[PDB]
Amino acid sequence: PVTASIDLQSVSYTDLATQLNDVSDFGKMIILKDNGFNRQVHVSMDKRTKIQLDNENVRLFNGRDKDSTNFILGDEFAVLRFYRNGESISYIAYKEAQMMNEIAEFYAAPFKKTRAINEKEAFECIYDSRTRSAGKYPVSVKINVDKAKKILNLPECDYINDYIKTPQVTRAVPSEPKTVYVICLRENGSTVYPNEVSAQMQDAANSVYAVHGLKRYVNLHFVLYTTEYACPSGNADEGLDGFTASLKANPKAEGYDDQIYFLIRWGTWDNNILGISWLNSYNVNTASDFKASGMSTTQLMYPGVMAHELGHILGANHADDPKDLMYSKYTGYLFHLSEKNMDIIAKNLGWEIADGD
Numbered sequence: 001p002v003t004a005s006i007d008l009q010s011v012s013y014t015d016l017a018t019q020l021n022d023v024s025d026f027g028k029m030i031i032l033k034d035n036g037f038n039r040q041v042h043v044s045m046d047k048r049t050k051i052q053l054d055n056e057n058v059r060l061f062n063g064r065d066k067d068s069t070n071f072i073l074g075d076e077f078a079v080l081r082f083y084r085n086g087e088s089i090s091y092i093a094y095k096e097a098q099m100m101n102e103i104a105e106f107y108a109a110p111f112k113k114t115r116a117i118n119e120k121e122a123f124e125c126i127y128d129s130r131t132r133s134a135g136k137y138p139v140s141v142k143i144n145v146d147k148a149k150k151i152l153n154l155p156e157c158d159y160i161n162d163y164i165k166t167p168q169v170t171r172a173v174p175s176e177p178k179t180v181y182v183i184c185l186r187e188n189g190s191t192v193y194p195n196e197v198s199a200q201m202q203d204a205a206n207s208v209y210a211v212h213g214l215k216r217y218v219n220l221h222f223v224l225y226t227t228e229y230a231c232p233s234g235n236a237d238e239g240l241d242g243f244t245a246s247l248k249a250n251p252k253a254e255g256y257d258d259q260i261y262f263l264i265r266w267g268t269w270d271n272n273i274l275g276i277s278w279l280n281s282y283n284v285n286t287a288s289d290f291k292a293s294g295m296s297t298t299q300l301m302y303p304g305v306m307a308h309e310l311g312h313i314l315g316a317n318h319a320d321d322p323k324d325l326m327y328s329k330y331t332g333y334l335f336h337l338s339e340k341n342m343d344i345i346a347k348n349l350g351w352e353i354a355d356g357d
């Protein structure tokens with residue numbers, strides 16, 4: 001048996017799909033290669049999280065913790081994200097030639113303002129060298145997000161006061177995890193990109209499961225569709241008030257008032273604000289009245305914003321450690337470190353310390 005491999009110098013949608021679709025319930029060793037770079041990862045299907053984007057099914061895959069590697073697969077796109085030298089790198093491949101060209105143009109465009117000779121380390125269109133004809137269209141893009149911000153001299157977005165505090169409202173580990181829907185609603189007039197949205201959802205889900213063995217208690221089911229609602233101004237607080245009001249006012253949403261809701265967009269709000277949520281608004285026993293709602297950017301350059309806002313929804317406050325997901329400034333980290341926050345989030349999902357981790 002020769003070990004399955006993915007050549008990142010030529011990685012296409014069909015490469016990722018064929019390899020990931022071969023992953024069984026017992027997992028599969030896959031070698032990631034990039035010229036001299038070589039990493040063996042053990043990949044498994046993520047059975048905890050379901051995603052539909054406008055009814056399109058998206059599957060997630062995980063490496064081991066030591067592998068530092070995540071995958072996303074839809075019919076239309078696939079993503080490999082992993083870390084090298086402590087920097088997050090995404091390979092993004094769309095199946096359809098025209099969509100892939102469009103996506104490559106979209107990601108390339110911001111780098112045409114200013115050019116560096118190290119640009120390739122931040123952003124690269126990947127071409128199929130196996131087509132010795134010499135592929136004209138790229139088959140994927142590679143983006144090093146940490147490096148990309150440095151070249152782009154981005155205007156730095158942040159949280160500021162990104163939550164609003166509201167009045168406050170036998171038990172064992174459940175026989176099956178409780179399904180909690182996270183209903184993500186594409187803001188009227190927003191374009192969001194499937195690879196970007198699913199990456200936010202994956203990081204949000206994984207931030208929960210990493211805490212107190214919470215997969216025992218909850219399995220998150222993300223769905224995305226479009227809402228007629230759009231924020232009336234640039235202000236995040238006013239936007240969130242209107243969004244929650246839009247849910248309550250919609251006869252279509254009657255009977256789903258106990259789920260979690262995000263208004264999503266690609267852009268940000270006034271004061272370069274990344275998102276906003278109602279603090280401590282979801283509890284598995286008392287969830288009601290569309291209280292568990294928030295708003296989030298989904299752009300690639302700000303990974304973990306949805307995770308951070310979901311953190312607030314589940315009760316997490318800002319943490320003191322700059323490496324915490326819940327730090328008060330955006331720092332790109334994707335896990336809760338605060339024991340106080342972990343206990344709050346876990347309790348709201350049905351855990352108590354006697355259950356262990």
Ligand SMILES: [Zn+2]
Pocket residue numbers: 159162163308312318326327328
């Ligand atoms: Zn915050």
